[PDB]
Structure formats: C-alpha cells, structure tokens
Structure 1
Amino acid sequence: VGNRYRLGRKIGSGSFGDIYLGTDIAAGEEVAIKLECVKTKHPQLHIESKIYKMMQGGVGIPTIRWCGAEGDYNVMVMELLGPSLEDLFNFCSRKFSLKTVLLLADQMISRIEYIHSKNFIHRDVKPDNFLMGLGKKGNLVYIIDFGLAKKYRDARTHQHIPYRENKNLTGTARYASINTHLGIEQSRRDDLESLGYVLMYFNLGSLPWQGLKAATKRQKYERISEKKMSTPIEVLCKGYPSEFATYLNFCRSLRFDDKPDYSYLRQLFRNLFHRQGFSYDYVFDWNMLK
C-alpha cells in the first residue's frame, strides 16, 4: 500500500479481511499486512488494532507496526511471525509427540489467561490462531485474531457480563465448547474448553466429530454438537494420559462467571512432563525436520 509497502503472497485470511506477506521498503523489514475494505458495512480493523495495542507487552502478543487507511483499504501491519500450529501440524504429518503437545499446552493456557486478565475472551481458540515466532522468538507461541473477541467484564468494577441464551455459533465449530453449541454466551471457561479440544486434536490427529457431511452450515453444526455432547470425556481421551480428561472435566465444571484456576491446569501438564522425564529445552517436533 502507498509507495512504502509491497504486497507479496496472500497467506489466507483471519476474521474479516485478507492477510499478505509484505515488505516495508522504507523500514527494510518483511512484515504481514491485513486489508479491510474501507467502505465495509461493519468496520472492525481499527477496533481490533486497539485490542492488540491494549494487550501490548504481554508475552506472545504480536506488535502492530501501523494501522491506518490507504486507497480503498484500512491497513494493519503486523510484525512477521512464523507458521501457525495447524501449519506445523501439517509439516509434522498431522502427528505431534506428547512432549510437543505439553510444551504447547503450557504456553497456550498462559496466552488465554493473559487475554482474560485484560478483560477479554478470545472466542476463537483454534490451532490456526497460535503462531510460533521466528528467529530468537522461535520458542514463543503467539496468539492472534481478536476479530471475535469480546469484553467479558467491566475493566473498573469487574462486573461480569450476564448469562444469555440462543447465541449464534461464531468461531470454529470443531473446537467450540458444548455450551457454545447450545447457544450459551461464551465466558472464560469456553476459551479453555476449546483449548482442551485443540490438545486432543494434536494427540489424535483428528477429533471424532470431524468429517460429518451436511448440506448447510446449520446442519453441520447440529451434527458436530450432537457428536460432541454424546462422546464422554473418558471415551474421547481413551489411551492418552489422564491429564487431558482432567483438564476437560475441570473446564466443563466451571460456572459461567467462575475465574478458572489457570495454575492448576498448567500444573497438570507440567507434572506429566516431569513424570515422563522430558528435557526442558523447547525442542519441538518441527525442530527435528530435515
């Protein structure tokens, strides 16, 4: 955009707009650029940039270099990050070692806790929304995409949003909490339950509610909801360390406005990591690729 940014390859899309790799010619830096049509009915890129700015300084929160307008677009320039966890799962033949799953789990719980500490819920916890850093930040898991994020409490009083029903499923149905499928207003517990499904997806290679055929989105979400509700946690997690089922049961037991015990959840996986005798070196499956 303008005379400064050269747009490269389109690297897909997030919530509302296309994302490209690019070059900031003036600063001499490779970056990533998100474009929103300036005349869009529901503008949110500037709202999203202010969420990233409010979250700035938090571990694994990407830096926004610039957010403004150029031609027919609202533009947000982000620092260049590495592949998403879904990309890395594909590069690793859709199989992660237990050690890589546990290393990711620790950081993913912390990123969600941080967002919650800043009064927001993410509402779209999925592998594609966690990116590894590049270079010296290659061991750091970042969280992206605040397009569906919502404030769950007043920053001043900490008064929680009220319980609501008949809500539409926004987010990715594969990883949605059961309460989300049932139309309940999302809260802190839902971000963590979704992470529990992401962890089991990394363990299994797929979830048992994937690949269900449907003619419409509405039908597909119903089939996923029914399968997800009718699969006991102890069946879903069969043949994997008990910590994955304990984690999911804990999240599903939380009241709508409960504060999650994030340290208890990290400790489940940290204790398992120690019992397995794994080294604390941050060597992930993809670091072994030749």
Structure 2
Amino acid sequence: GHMGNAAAAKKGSEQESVKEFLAKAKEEFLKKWESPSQNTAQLDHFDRIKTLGTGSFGRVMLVKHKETGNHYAMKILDKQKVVKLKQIEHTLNEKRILQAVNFPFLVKLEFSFKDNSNLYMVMEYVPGGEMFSHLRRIGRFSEPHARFYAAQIVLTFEYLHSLDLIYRDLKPENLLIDQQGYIQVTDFGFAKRVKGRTWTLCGTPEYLAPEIILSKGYNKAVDWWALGVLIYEMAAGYPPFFADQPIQIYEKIVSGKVRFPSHFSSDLKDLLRNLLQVDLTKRFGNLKNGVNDIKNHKWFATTDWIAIYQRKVEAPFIPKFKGPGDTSNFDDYEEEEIRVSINEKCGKEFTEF
C-alpha cells in the first residue's frame, strides 16, 4: 500500500489527535457562543489614526489605545446604514462569531462597544496588509509560497467546520499578513452556523461554488471549492473563472471547465481538479475521509501541519514594518469624520451587540 507500518500508525495517530483537539475547541467555542462578551471599552479610550479599509456601511481605522499605546484595527459600522442595507443579522452574527472563536489564523476581537450612531469592533492590527496587495504586487506565488498560505486556510476551515460554521467569503482581499508572515482571516459578515444545508446567495463572484449560484441548497463543501479558487489564484496570479460581468463568471463556474497555466505542477493540477469539482459526491473535503483527503494529498506531502499550527515554520514573506502604527503596507483611503449623534439610533435592533 502507500504507507508502511510506521507511517500508517503515525498518520492514524495524528488524525485521532485532531479529533481530540476539535472536541475541546468546540466545547470552548460553545461556552462563549451562548454567553457572548459585551461593552468592554469605549470610544474616547482611543485615538483615531488612519483609515485602513472601507465598505458600504462602515470603515476600519487604525487606532491607538490611549492608556497603553497599543494599536488596533477598529471597524466602525453606521447603525442606520446597516439597517438600510439589511445587514443587522450579519453584523450581530459577525461579532458573536468573533468573540467566540479562537485559532491562530483568526483575527482576535479585543474590545467591542456601541454608541448612539455606531457599532465598534476593535480587533488586532495586522500590519503586513492584505494578501491581495502582495499577490498583485508580485504577480503570482511560487507553489511552496502558495502552499504555506493554503495550509493555514485548510487548518482554519477544519476548525471552523467542526463548529458548524461555513465561512463563505474566502478571497485574498480578506486575508491579512501578520508581522511573522502568517495569515489572519478577518471578515465574518457572511459566515453562518449551519448543521447541514443552507441556501443563501452570498459571497464574491469569482469564489462562488456552482451550488451557490444554482438554486439547490449547499453545505460546508462550498468552502473547499473556494479554497481551490484561492490556491489557483495564488499560484497563477488570476482566478480560474473570470469575465467582464458576474453573470458571465457564473456561466463559466457552472460549466466548471477549468484550464491551468503550463507552469502548474501535476500535483497542483490534481488537487485543484478535486477541489474545483462540480460534483458534490466527488469533491475533496466532502467525501467519507473529510479534510484528510486534502491534508494527505501529494501537493501537501511536505507540509508539517502541527508545525504550521504552532507557527514554527519560517514564512516565505516577512512584511516590512517601520514601527508601531506604520501603514506602509495598506492603500490610502479618503478620511471622513466619525460623528456621534446626540440621539440614539436603532437601539432595539442592536441590543445584543
């Protein structure tokens, strides 16, 4: 067979240890899931420094804790805009998830609070910038470089899925690079705790699984499709399915006729054909052996999963950091004032925040 006695026993033991870890992790998550933290700081505890990124109902700002001088990334959500965009449940669920999870590649929520106008999530500042920036700067990642990042996502999804969380917005734009060159996943605005199937049309066009586009229901295997898209984009410099308009992207996805750059290794192509598999009964991560089909694939043969988790692997790219509060790895964004109304807005809608 493929493994001699020693290798087979070692892999078996490793897989049983993952089960043991996930059992404890789930117990810890559920305690916090049922009893979330609330109101652990206030706005005048921080100086506002610079905008790090923006969206339609809020923005993320670099801030500095006045008492200790520590820097954080503070997401500011305009309650009225959140209501207008029908994002109430998404924003409450994002904060509920963030305060309950714990994993080395998930950004940590350090404080949260609200005032008359806004919601605030104060997260760790991840100063290396977005994977998106580095990928577009360098063109494409060599396969070992891509594999280093991919392994972190594999572990992170293995953890999230054990909690019945489906992530649903994987893409380089949502992955930050920390000072040691490891990945941080940040944005849980479309994640859902789901035991079985769900139906919502959500995510980003290039990363949607065929079964999200189509009316049929879908399960956590959409995240393994999205991993395939991410690995492809990291290694090629462009995603497997693109077009001028999303509707044309969806047509290509549902066909699923993927083609590969000639520099892709055969191992990489085999992995991607098994992740970018339209047939759910054949997609890696969705078969009887679960995540083990991915982790044991030849393309990951050099990956030491425990060493990745322990952050003991030397990263392929270490961002330049000229000191605390340095934003040289981020784009510039227009700076607007942060106004706090004299009158409370949408109080009842956001009681749980």
Matched, 1:143 2:180: no
Distance 2:263 2:240 in 1: 15
CA distance in 1, matches of 2:296, 2:287: 19
SS at match of 1:3: helix
Shift of 1:243: 3.0
Number of the residue aligned with 1:2: 43
* Root-mean-square deviation over aligned CA pairs: 2.8
Structure 1 counterpart of 2:217, one-letter code:
E
Equivalent runs, 1:144-159 vs 2, <5 Å = 144-153=186-195
Conserved 8 A contact 2:165-2:193:
yes
Matches of 1:45 and 1:177 in 2, distance apart? 23
Residue 99 of structure 1, CA deviation: 1.3
In structure 1, what is the equivalent of residue 300 of structure 2? 270
Alpha-carbon shift at residue 287 of structure 1 (Å): 6.1
Structure 1 residue 59 displacement after superposition: 2.6
Which residue in the other structure is 2:241 paired with?
Answer: 209
Conserved 8 A contact 2:233-2:240:
no
Equivalent residue of 2:139, what SS?
coil
Deviation at 1:130, TM superposition (A): 1.7
For 1:13 and 1:240, how far apart are their aligned partners in 2? 34
Partners of 1:15 and 1:108 in 2: CA distance = 27
Matched residue, 1:172: 204
Write the deviation string for residues 128-147 of structure 1: whole angstroms up to 9, x where unpaired: 2222222xxx1432212110
In structure 1, how many angstroms separate the alpha carbons of the residues matched to 2:216 and 2:230? 20
Q: Contact conserved, 2:182 with 2:315, CA < 8 A, in 1?
A: no
- Give the drift of 1:32: 0.2
CA contact (8 A) 2:232 2:272 kept: no
Q: Look up the SS of the partner of 2:44 in the other structure.
A: coil
Corresponding position: 1:236 with 2:260? yes
Query: Mean Cα displacement is larger for which, 258-267 or 19-28?
Result: 258-267
SS at match of 2:296: helix
Change (3 A) 1:87 1:79: same
The share of aligned pairs that are identical, in percent, is: 20
- Distance in 2 (CA, whole Å) between partners of 1:59 and 1:84 is 17
Query: For the structure 1 residues 208 and 188, does the alpha-carbon distance in structure 2 shift closer, same or farther, using more than 3 Å as the test?
Result: closer
In structure 1, the residue matched to 2:60 is 19
Larger Rg, first or second structure (1 or 2): 2
Q: Which amino acid aligns with 1:173?
A: P
1:283 match: secondary structure? coil
CA distance in 2, matches of 1:250, 1:209: 16
Count of matched residue positions in the alignment of Structure 1 and Structure 2: 261
Relative to 1, partners in 2 of residues 1:32 and 1:287: Cα closer, same or farther, differing over 3 Å? closer
Structure-to-structure mapping, 1:6-155, within 5 angstroms: 6-13=47-54, 16-39=57-80, 40-41=82-83, 42-43=87-88, 44-56=90-102, 58-82=103-127, 83-91=129-137, 93-134=138-179, 138-153=180-195
- Decide whether aligned partners of structure 1 residues 34 and 121 sit closer, same or farther in structure 2, where only a CA change above 3 A counts: same
Name the SS of the counterpart of 1:196 in structure 2. helix
Question: 8 Å contact 1:96–1:285 — kept in the other structure?
Answer: no
Structure of higher RCO (CA pairs closer than 8 Å, 6+ residues apart): 2
8 A contact 1:130–1:144 mirrored in 2? yes
Shift of 1:21: 1.1
Q: CA deviation at 1:18?
A: 1.1
Q: In the TM superposition, what whole-angstrom CA distance separates every residue of 1:91-113 from its partner, at most 9, and x where no partner exists?
A: 4x222111101111111111111
Q: Is the 8 A contact 2:151 2:303 kept in 1?
A: no
Q: Distance in 1 between matches of 2:246 and 2:170?
A: 17
Query: Deviation digits for residues 61-85 of structure 1, max 9, x if unmatched?
Result: 2221111113411101001113221
